[PDB]
């Protein structure tokens, strides 16, 4: 709910280049950047149309997106007049993943001629860059070729880094589309690199071997995620297998130490269970929780009609080894809710991690929608605290706002993690910043709250007659984490007999008015400020209504314009926190 | 020679019923199963 | 006049297995000479005796490995041509076209491990009527043979044809006499440093093995 | 009985090795000539039917036992239910011939017509498998699975087109049956059974009273 | 054989001017026939001739038998192979040939290996199946069991539908070497083991000499 929507950072590219098909953050060692994948972008590579490139987008100052050269060369040759590879339309940048100084991008549709017969097989390839270093990583480009081997693997279709600096790579086409999970440590990927060897063997490689023919066409490695699930510290391998179990879809979890086999399964046919997966601890118990997406899931309404809405299965990891699976349905028909699932870290800094789920083909004019879900003790709060809308219309391929997204990165050092949303259909990429969260301890006391109409204590200047008075007292105290002003000015509003066109039976003494406002300026983390004043009851023969309680209402508004900082990022007040409170007072008889 | 549970012989000459064989100039797997070493090979005691 | 004949009813219909020959249509053809070609076999059971073929065990392998534990049961399966272990033998692929058999089945046990690996095995025949044995000490009261590995690496045991009737079925229907002819239980008495070896096992037909009454069920 | 394991010499044992006695046996039902001398049903084409024996279903009695031999000889007997006259033409004859009546033609006589046909191949013996130029012999390098595999069923196999007994043609051939006479066989080949899913292939045998 | 693990079953084979001695022998296996059938037939008009220089051993490599190879691993060698000797200059000189084969397969690893190979001569091998390997002993075969032998010697005649063959379009025989029990290298076994063939044609007859661009 704290994401900035007023002026979010927009980035663009060449039209038709699919700018925004993949996005990530790049934090090296002390400037901050943005990585956008444009798998259809033309390059200056010799005789390669739409080779695809990855762009490093400068967040600092201007909105410049400088392309990154992983490979500037053309198609290498196997022999004389015999090309070895086909980088044309290789979709490089279809998947981009970064960890510190290491940037990994891949080309799922990179084709490669065998070292034997003249073939054209999509083994896929990747380019790993470590600052000044840059190697090639094509684990599926091996001696095992042609369909039943790794020939149609399309390695790099999905990628992820582990905490022990180990690469997780998925290829949905290995062994007649059984799919394959391939994991290599970043050490050997560069250490065993050889520009003259096309099929590099890595000594410490973990991989899923070929299985029975009944496992064919399952698409393992379609999507990947990392997290620990056996409690040994090492990130394990979570992958979606959307065609497994006769198109019911499955999700496999392997051990991140030896590729040893939990297994999730879908409830509906062809709902694409496993199209996307995500692993993040959502309930603060430091146990990685599994999120699985199924954008094609159909739900029934009160009319009992099937409607494709999409579904995400939230599986909470218990210490028992079991899971506490919760299903979260989509909101718009044919919007494909759950196409992308992005862990956000603690977006609001409340103590629990948060997550974002997108319906890329939702919203007005099929612009796209991203839903923000906050985590808590019980699990994931199923109601979205914020709804991010696309702002761009279609051209041929729909805007696809939310098709890919990345979060959990404090890119502006405000103490709050931000979010990138890619809309490749319109070649755009959008960065939403997180506004600082201000918790506020507002107070209101009415004493005495049982008013004696014949008390008549407080005198009233101007007249010799005294009135039945009492004290109203309101207090403010606010504090927040991250970067935010130490001074906070509020606008407090007070109304007596809020319940009442009708006559108000109480008003403030030193104003003779039921309404009173107070420009209050408190300090962040500082003590509680509290100003009180005297209110009095009207004369007994001024109204008949003596049974209805007099409600005292207090309301406050923060000055957002003056609370802004540098770029103009205005803080926000905590959700589920009442912006106003009310106490009452009775009269006796 | 083949399938007979009866013996009604032939109206016709062999020259018309079948095709006649020609000589130029039970064989193998009957001699191979008959040369099978059946006897015990050790020094039988008791 | 001419010869009177009574054309009988119920006679003369085509029977797909009648001992009658068709009428010629085309005469005086001489074949190319084929005398003394190599490999002539006249009887399907002559090839099933001169040529043993492998059995099939857990994991689809023709061998059974030497287990080292309190268990000593290598294989234990129904004496039935329709068994799973017998399913890839030529003797069971040829017996699927007959309804009854009789006689002896030979099992050939060839030991494969190295020269310093030594073992002792035991094959027994449990007749039907009570459960098959689970230890070699209980199976020593059956008809058994016991051998150990040495210079000669193959041992052959003949499963005896015990039955109430002279013939037994080659198929299996329910728990019934003719389709359960007992069991055949392979044990491992001892072994010395024979860990993970293999004892490949074959099977063939005995001297008096017989197989009669052709039939065509399905599935070559 | 112990013996050299790899001698490949046939080693039979008996029940005399532990006190039995080998009984006499009758083996007339596994004789090659006896067992292959049955009619077997073949799926016929509409009009023209080249008379190849490898057109028999392989799961049948005569089909499975014929394919258990590399080379074979036999005269052929044919039973045909047809409409109109049925013409036969020997091995190596043109197709246009199937139209001419001088070739052996059997006029329609209900219900069917069975003919004795000789062996007319140029070869001393026919074959069920013929290595023209196929398998390299090294695990078939793992290649084909998926859609093409049904087409890939027949690719590794084949036959010369002189391995036949001629052709038959009628206006409409309804049913066709082959019967092998004087069957000789050479060089036996593998023969497989049904692989069970249970520990034993159970089935439904005919059930009288008791 | 011998009273100890040491082994003395000597067998020598001379084809032409080339010999081959083995001390771990099991005997020669004859397949489908011991002699030849009639060479002179009605299909060569008496123009067949015997070439005696072509009957001698030639060597070839089959495969490495490693411990990772499990049951069913095949190696198929179609005979006649690509031959650079005088037997090779017969398929370029003459149109029809016929011959038997004298096949001797060798797998040397010491007697502290386990495992078992099955070498077999298969006629007309157009296609092999995983289940058909269980019945591979229907053909002329011998096992190679490292505890007992290293050699398998298989002699075999000419088979075909025709009396003479056109080897440029037909390979009648096929040498298949199958793993029936995987290799083991226990403590003292040889780590891998290479499999070699030592083949020699027998009774080679040729007929019909083709023209020459020489
Ligand atoms: C008649 O009218 C007069 C004038 O309006 C009323 O005066 C009030 O008296 C209250 C009790 O003394 C007083 O409460 C506050 O001040 C007290 C000391 O004078 C102090 O003890 C209180 O703290 C405690 O008070 C809270 C109040 O909610 C209680 O909940 C706790 O239990 C403690 O007692 C308060 O700080 C009040 O400020 C004062 N107001 C005024 C305007 O004079 C008087 O109560 C009326 N009496 C009748 C007839 O009801
Ligand atoms: C006590 C007082 O003057 N209140 C005013 C309030 O009415 C006004 O809305 C606000 C605007 O910032 O400034 C203050
Ligand atoms: O070794 C066990 C393995 O062998 C092979 C197949 O039968 C598998 O199903 C089984 O898992
Ligand atoms: O064919 C059944 C047989 O196949 C193989 C393995 O799965 C075995 O466990 C199984 O018993
Ligand atoms: O069925 C045999 C098969 O079983 C299972 C696995 O152990 C494989 O490694 C092995 O090949
Ligand atoms: Ca782990
Ligand atoms: Ca958790
Ligand atoms: Ca949170
Ligand atoms: Ca921020």
Residue numbers in the entry:
A (entry chain A): 1 to 29, 32 to 263, 265 to 503, 506 to 594
B (entry chain 4): 15 to 39, 65 to 85
C (entry chain 3): 1 to 220
D (entry chain 1): 1 to 210
E (entry chain 2): 5 to 218
Lines from the paper:
Structures of several serotypes determined at near atomic resolution have revealed a capsid composed of 60 copies each of four structural proteins (VP1 to VP4). A prominent feature of this otherwise rather smooth capsid is an exposed flexible loop (∼30 residues) on VP1, termed the GH loop. This loop and the RGD motif embedded within it (residues 145–147 in the O serotype) comprise a major site of neutralization by the host humoral immune response and mediate FMDV binding integrin89101112.
For each virus the two well-resolved classes corresponded to distinct poses of the integrin, for PanAsia these were termed A and A′ and for O1M, A and B. The integrin portion for these complexes was resolved at 10.8 Å (pose A, 4.9% of sub-particles) and 11.5 Å (pose A′, 4.2% of sub-particles) for PanAsia and at 8.6 Å (pose A, 5.9% of sub-particles) and 12.3 Å (pose B, 6.7% of sub-particles) for O1M (resolution assessment uses the ‘gold standard' protocol). In this conformation, the integrin molecule is almost perpendicular to the surface of the virus, as might be expected for initial engagement at the crowded cell surface. The VP1 GH loop, to which it attaches via interactions with the RGD motif and downstream hydrophobic residues, is extended up away from the virus surface. At this resolution the cryo-EM density for the integrin does not reveal detailed interactions; however, there is density consistent with the RGD in the FMDV GH loop binding at the interface of the αv and β6 integrin subunits. Unexpectedly, in pose A, additional density was observed bridging the integrin to the virus surface (for both PanAsia and O1M). The quality of the density and lack of density in virus-only maps, rules out this being adventitious attachment of HS. The significance of this interaction remains unclear since both viruses examined are tissue culture adapted and therefore bear mutations in this region, and the glycosylation of the recombinant integrin (Man5GlcNAc2)29 may differ from that seen in the course of natural infection.
